Curated annotation (Swiss-Prot):
The chain holds residues 373 to 427 of 593 of the full protein. The lineage of its organism: Bacteria, Bacillati, Bacillota, Bacilli, Lactobacillales. It comes from Streptococcus sp. group G. The gene is spg. This is Immunoglobulin G-binding protein G. Sequence repeats lie at residues 2-56. It is found in: Secreted, Cell wall.
């Protein structure tokens, strides 16, 4: 299904969405994406909205 990452960063704000099978596979993608974009922060996951947040 569609998973969302809400980015509340020092440089980048925004929202990315991907298609993934599981919240676990979505997390691996999103950690790779945060890595790639120099984002290091506090994370949550909300199952109702299928949404991770990372906040710097």
């Amino acid at each position: 299904m569609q998973f969302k990452l809400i980015i509340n960063g020092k440089t980048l704000k925004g929202e990315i969405t991907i298609e993934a099978v599981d919240a676990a596979e979505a997390e691996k993608f999103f950690k790779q994406y945060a890595n790639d974009n120099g984002i290091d922060g506090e994370w949550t996951y909300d199952d109702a909205t299928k949404t991770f947040t990372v906040t710097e």
